[PDB]
Design a protein around this ligand. Structure first.
Ligand SMILES: *[C@@H]1O[C@H](CO)[C@@H](O[C@@H]2O[C@H](CO)[C@@H](O[C@@H]3O[C@H](CO)[C@@H](O)[C@H](O)[C@@H]3O)[C@H](O)[C@H]2NC(C)=O)[C@H](O)[C@H]1NC(C)=O
Ligand SMILES: *[C@H]1O[C@H](CO)[C@@H](O)[C@H](O)[C@@H]1O
Ligand SMILES: [Cl-]
Ligand SMILES: [Cl-]
Length: 221
């Protein structure tokens, strides 16, 4: 179990819960056809009305911790329980207002993921753990400036031998991309992009040889 609950933008920590819609607990989303797959559910109120200004090309850290509280000292399952092998993924969607409550019907493009490396048997979850919950990635430099949601997700495949089984731990950050260019990427639907036939979602981790994370290929400029 894990929760994305804070952001750093080009080395500046924004603060616990700031510009993130933080779920009330670390309970997983398990239904890929639920609207809960978009940005989770049951947000801590009142939800932040901060929209983090981020230059296109800028470096963002999405901070995962074991619980919705963020860092509360030593915990062997902070940022996640390391037995919970799986990928880490980041997506953006262009939105009219990054504080708007309705997150349905958006078009999500993947900007980063950390899957599995067979030769080292290392998962993105392992790297996330080593990195103290820091999922660090850059915002594509060519993107159209404006308001976006930043969906960052940790998937535990520990029990993903059938569907339902995969456990999805995700939140949406609220960002305002500045500078940039004019690229408006093709995105996918949530729900929709993840299906019960995807070997990225239905996976026996004790029988993994190669692994491909679910969803579209990573967008690059
Ligand atoms: C995960 O990310 C956190 C949150 O940003 C990392 O902590 C931060 O690390 C930075 C960069 O090394 C520290 O910056 C330094 O600040 C000191 C003064 O406080 C200054 O003298 C240096 O010039 C430098 O800019 C920052 O202080 C620190 N912020 C925290 C701890 O809140 C953390 O290291 C990352 N964890 C892992 C395992 O990578
Ligand atoms: C954000 O900052 C990182 C270093 O923290 C760079 O690697 C990246 O190019 C971007 O400037
Ligand atoms: Cl746990
Ligand atoms: Cl460009």
């Amino acid at each position: 179990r894990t929760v994305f609950s804070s952001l750093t933008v080009n080395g500046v920590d924004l603060g616990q819960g700031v510009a993130v819609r933080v779920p009330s607990s670390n309970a997983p989303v398990t239904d890929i056809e639920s609207d809960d797959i978009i940005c989770n559910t049951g947000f801590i109120q009142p939800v932040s009305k901060t929209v983090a200004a981020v230059p296109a090309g800028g470096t963002v850290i999405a901070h995962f911790h074991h619980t919705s509280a963020g860092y509360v000292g030593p915990d062997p399952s902070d940022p996640l329980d390391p037995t919970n092998k799986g990928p880490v993924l980041a997506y953006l969607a262009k939105v009219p207002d990054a504080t708007q409550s309705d997150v349905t019907g958006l078009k999500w493009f993947k900007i980063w993921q950390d899957g599995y490396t067979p030769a080292t048997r290392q998962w993105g979850s392992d790297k996330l753990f080593i990195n103290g919950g820091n999922a660090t990635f850059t915002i594509p430099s060519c993107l159209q400036a404006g308001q976006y949601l930043l969906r960052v997700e940790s998937i535990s495949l520990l029990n993903a031998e059938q569907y339902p089984g995969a456990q999805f731990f995700l939140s949406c950050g609220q960002i305002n991309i500045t500078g940039g260019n004019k690229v408006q990427p093709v995105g996918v639907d949530f729900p929709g992009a993840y299906t019960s036939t995807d070997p990225g979602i239905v996976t026996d981790i004790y029988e993994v040889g190669t692994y491909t994370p679910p969803g579209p290929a990573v967008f690059s400029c």
